[PDB]
Amino acid sequence: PLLRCLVLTGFGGYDKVKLQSRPAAPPAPGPGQLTLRLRACGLNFADLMARQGLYDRLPPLPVTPGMEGAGVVIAVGEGVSDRKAGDRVMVLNRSGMWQEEVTVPSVQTFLIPEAMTFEEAAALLVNYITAYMVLFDFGNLQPGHSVLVHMAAGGVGMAAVQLCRTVENVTVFGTASASKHEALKENGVTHPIDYHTTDYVDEIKKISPKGVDIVMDPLGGSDTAKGYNLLKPMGKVVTYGMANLLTGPKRNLMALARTWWNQFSVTALQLLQANRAVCGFHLGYLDGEVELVSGVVARLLALYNQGHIKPHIDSVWPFEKVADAMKQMQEKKNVGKVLLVP
Amino acid sequence: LLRCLVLTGFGGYDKVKLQSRPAAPPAPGPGQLTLRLRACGLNFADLMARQGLYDRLPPLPVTPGMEGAGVVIAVGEGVSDRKAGDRVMVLNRSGMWQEEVTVPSVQTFLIPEAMTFEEAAALLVNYITAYMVLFDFGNLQPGHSVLVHMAAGGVGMAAVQLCRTVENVTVFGTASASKHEALKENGVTHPIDYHTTDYVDEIKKISPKGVDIVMDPLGGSDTAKGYNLLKPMGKVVTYGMANLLQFSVTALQLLQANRAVCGFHLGYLDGEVELVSGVVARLLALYNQGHIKPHIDSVWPFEKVADAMKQMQEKKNVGKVLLVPGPE
Numbered sequence: 001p002l003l004r005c006l007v008l009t010g011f012g013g014y015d016k017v018k019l020q021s022r023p024a025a026p027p028a029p030g031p032g033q034l035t036l037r038l039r040a041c042g043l044n045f046a047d048l049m050a051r052q053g054l055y056d057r058l059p060p061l062p063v064t065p066g067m068e069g070a071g072v073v074i075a076v077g078e079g080v081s082d083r084k085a086g087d088r089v090m091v092l093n094r095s096g097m098w099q100e101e102v103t104v105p106s107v108q109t110f111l112i113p114e115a116m117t118f119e120e121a122a123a124l125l126v127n128y129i130t131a132y133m134v135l136f137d138f139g140n141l142q143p144g145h146s147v148l149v150h151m152a153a154g155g156v157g158m159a160a161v162q163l164c165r166t167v168e169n170v171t172v173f174g175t176a177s178a179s180k181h182e183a184l185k186e187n188g189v190t191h192p193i194d195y196h197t198t199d200y201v202d203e204i205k206k207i208s209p210k211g212v213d214i215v216m217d218p219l220g221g222s223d224t225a226k227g228y229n230l231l232k233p234m235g236k237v238v239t240y241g242m243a244n245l246l247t248g249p250k251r252n253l254m255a256l257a258r259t260w261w262n263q264f265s266v267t268a269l270q271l272l273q274a275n276r277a278v279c280g281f282h283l284g285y286l287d288g289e290v291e292l293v294s295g296v297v298a299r300l301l302a303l304y305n306q307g308h309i310k311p312h313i314d315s316v317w318p319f320e321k322v323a324d325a326m327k328q329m330q331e332k333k334n335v336g337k338v339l340l341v342p
Numbered sequence: 343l344l345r346c347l348v349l350t351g352f353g354g355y356d357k358v359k360l361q362s363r364p365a366a367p368p369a370p371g372p373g374q375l376t377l378r379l380r381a382c383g384l385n386f387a388d389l390m391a392r393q394g395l396y397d398r399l400p401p402l403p404v405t406p407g408m409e410g411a412g413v414v415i416a417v418g419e420g421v422s423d424r425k426a427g428d429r430v431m432v433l434n435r436s437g438m439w440q441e442e443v444t445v446p447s448v449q450t451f452l453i454p455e456a457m458t459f460e461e462a463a464a465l466l467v468n469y470i471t472a473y474m475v476l477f478d479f480g481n482l483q484p485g486h487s488v489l490v491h492m493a494a495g496g497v498g499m500a501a502v503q504l505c506r507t508v509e510n511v512t513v514f515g516t517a518s519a520s521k522h523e524a525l526k527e528n529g530v531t532h533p534i535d536y537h538t539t540d541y542v543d544e545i546k547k548i549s550p551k552g553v554d555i556v557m558d559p560l561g562g563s564d565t566a567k568g569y570n571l572l573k574p575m576g577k578v579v580t581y582g583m584a585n586l587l588q589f590s591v592t593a594l595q596l597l598q599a600n601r602a603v604c605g606f607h608l609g610y611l612d613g614e615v616e617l618v619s620g621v622v623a624r625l626l627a628l629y630n631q632g633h634i635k636p637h638i639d640s641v642w643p644f645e646k647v648a649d650a651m652k653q654m655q656e657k658k659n660v661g662k663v664l665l666v667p668g669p670e
Contacts, residue, residue: 056598137575138602140481217593224593233611234478236602239593264593268558268565268580271605273397277479277577278603280596286574287600 004342005099006319009062011053013250014323017065024101027075034083035103036091038071040122040316043338044155045218045241046284048330050095052252054245057285059095066097066340067284070112070121080106088112090121092129092293094284098319100342107290110297113305123155123311123337128300129293130283131159134216134238138279145213146171148204148230150223151243152189153180153335160216161188162309173204173212183335187312201226211235219243224264228278236277239264247330312336345644345667346440350403352394355648358406365442368416375424376444377432379412381463381641384650384663385496386559386582387609391436392651393587398609400436407438407665408609411453411462421447429453431462433470433618435609439644441667448615451622454630464496464636464662469625470618471608472500475557475579479604486554487512489545489571491564492584493530494521494660499637501557502529507633514553516541524660528637542567552576565589569603577602587655637661643668 002021010016027035047065050058058065070090076083083089089109096102112121135141147164151157152174164170165188174189181192191207193200204212213234215227218241227237245252245259266278286293303309314336317325328334343365351357368376388406391399414428424430430450437443453462476482488505492498493515505511506529515530522533532548534541545553554575556568559582566589568578580603591603611618628634639661642650645668654663 133575137481138577140478220593220597233614234474234617236479236604239597242594242597265590266603268561268589268603268605269583271603272561272580272583272607273605273610275606275611276604277579278591278593278596279577279601280593280598281575281600282597285598285600289574292575 003100004319005064006066006322006340007062008051008058008065011051011061011252014326016051017322017326019319019322029075029077029103031078032080032106033077033103034073034080034089034106034109035075035101036071036073036089036109037101038069038097038099038342039118040070041066041098041340042068042122042126043325043329043340044068044126045243045246045329046126046282048326049242049246051326052246052249054242054252055284057094064096064099066095066099068092068122068125069097069102070118073109076106082106083109088118088121090125092125092283098322098340107294110294110301113301116304119313119316119339120311122339123313124300125297126283127155127159127311127337128163128309129296130156130240130281131163131216132296132300133283134240134281135160135163135214138238138281139214139236141167141170141214143168143170146173146208146232147214147216148173148175148212148227149189149216150175151218151332152176152184152187152192154218154332155334155337156218156240157216158187158312158336159309164188166303166308171208173207175200177332180335201230204230214238216240220245221259221264222262224278228264228266228276231274231276233275236279238279238281240281247332314338316341318342344441346405346442347407347644347647347665348403349392349406352392352402355651357392358647358651360644360647368444370416370418370444372418373420373447374418374444375414375421375447375450376416376442377412377414377430377450378442379410379438379440379667380459381411382407382438382665383409383463383467384654384665385409385467386584386654387467387607389587389651389655390583395583396609398435405437405440407434407436407440409433409463409466410438410443411459414450417447423447424450429459429462431466433466433608439647439665448619451619451626454626457629460638460641460664461636463664464638465625465629466622467608468496468500468662469504469634469636470621471497471581471606472504473621473625475581475606476501476504476555479579479602479606480555480577482508482511482555484509484511487514487549487573488555488557489553489568490515490530490557492559492657493517493525493528493533495559495657496659496662497559497581498557499528499661500634503634505529507628512549514541514545514548518657521660542571545571555579558582560584561586562588565603569601572599572601574600577604579604579606581606639663641666
């Protein structure tokens with residue numbers, strides 16, 4: 001038979017991702033490695049960034065993209081003693097997850113709870129690990145705090161809103177199109193704001209003149225500066241994405257050097273006088289901290305088993321319609337996770 | 343009868359004058375109280391303030407000083423938690439370098455029976471700073487490694503002691519080689535001679551990845567060195583400009599490095615009485631539990647305020663430098 005997979009063959013529009021095949025050879029994973037068949041693959045903003053050549057560490061083209069997936073183990077290499085054929089597992093990697101069969105280090109896989117579906121598992125890792133580390137490891141989210149979650153209807157955003165509810169009395173401001181406000185309030189947003197029909201900075205200050213304690217910034221650019229200045233004493237803005245670029249254009253423009261005009265910069269003296277902190281985060285740029293990531297996953301699985309987090313699914317697309325799947329996200333039409341299925 | 347120090351201009355040590363006014367009948371307004379100080383703390387912030395570098399500093403002439411410890415002699419209406427005779431420590435923007443002072447009651451805290459005025463006067467500024475830098479911004483966690491600059495200073499020592507309340511924290515502290523033994527004693531895992539060896543190099547020998555938290559009271563060119571010494575998820579927190587007596591980063595750079603840069607200054611913290619009060623409550627509990635002990639370097643009467651400032655400006659102090667009204 002034949003195993004299918006998606007291949008990025010160049011940088012540019014949606015048409016640069018091609019569906020290709022390959023002969024299914026018998027599984028022979030080396031030591032400490034696992035071979036598995038995927039049932040669902042996650043789509044992340046970092047994938048759109050990769051596709052336009054903005055990712056400093058995407059392996060040499062052509063390559064199969066994708067950072068997360070969920071599936072079944074069909075083969076285990078020598079050494080590994082906590083995984084067996086037939087185990088349902090979710091997996092995290094730098095690339096290569098958008099295909100039917102993957103071989104990876106066992107330590108990069110995690111057991112899926114019995115009650116969790118493959119779809120939920122594929123929608124969990126990247127979004128919730130990011131939200132968790134942004135809110136807790138950097139933000140040090142505390143009871144009585146107020147948070148601004150940009151793109152609150154997106155995967156990370158929805159994960160962030162849900163996590164904010166696991167802490168007492170946290171006021172959540174969330175930005176997204178008015179058309180999604182109802183879903184925003186149902187997920188846990190306190191004050192939904194349409195950054196397209198209003199000025200979100202003013203809209204937040206009318207309600208909380210002092211500002212907020214944490215700003216989650218997946219936008220970057222001139223929005224980082226607005227986040228920083230929206231901070232209350234002891235607050236922090238955490239940048240984990242550059243949506244103000246990777247979104248909109250179907251092909252990257254080299255006149256993005258102009259983008260420099262809007263890059264946010266800070267001096268220690270400014271931070272000192274304002275009692276603020278600016279932080280940066282990207283799971284795709286996190287260097288070999290398996291023990292750190294693993295501890296976070298465990299926390300998330302416990303929250304799941306207790307009914308406190310539930311990955312919401314926006315849509316599921318077959319490898320054949322990857323173009324539309326990427327469009328769903330880039331055009332900001334999704335409410336929840338966008339997944340791909342073999 | 344009552345003495346008080348006054349900053350009559352921005353300059354060196356000579357700018358601080360010692361005046362004396364007659365004792366008037368205490369008349370605390372609503373929610374405020376009056377107290378007689380027994381000890382006043384000396385901080386770097388005061389040297390900056392005296393150098394015309396503090397933007398929240400009242401108009402000259404003014405009495406400098408952020409902390410003191412003393413006895414309550416009069417309470418106003420509304421205040422039901424204080425009575426004449428109570429021993430308290432107090433935090434303020436200024437005005438603490440004098441014998442008598444009137445302040446908002448919510449800015450004072452009761453001193454434990456076992457703690458002395460001297461210790462109380464050495465507690466607030468230094469330990470609140472170390473606590474909020476290590477926990478609020480740093481989010482200190484077990485198994486973490488921390489770089490404490492000026493480990494033998496007031497904030498430095500408070501920090502080392504606070505790191506020891508969290509399990510398995512590795513502490514790198516810099517100071518004169520002649521202060522290394524007192525460093526080991528206070529809890530420093532790896533003392534570094536700032537003056538003879540490159541601390542960046544000395545630290546990477548032991549921990550290649552770097553450290554989780556860098557405490558920067560120096561500022562200037564050390565902020566940058568601290569930044570590049572951070573492990574993933576690490577943060578450098580600047581709370582002083584001690585070198586003055588530059589560093590610049592973009593959000594994109596932070597994103598690709600998974601790092602944070604923070605700034606702290608108890609003097610620019612506005613109206614956050616609930617926040618600070620929360621920290622002091624935890625600091626007191628630790629003292630009663632025996633986890634913190636403010637160390638006093640030297641005590642000076644108001645007449646020798648110059649010597650007190652000089653003592654700290656020349657980095658001769660190992661612990662807190664204090665001021666006492668002194669003998670008549």
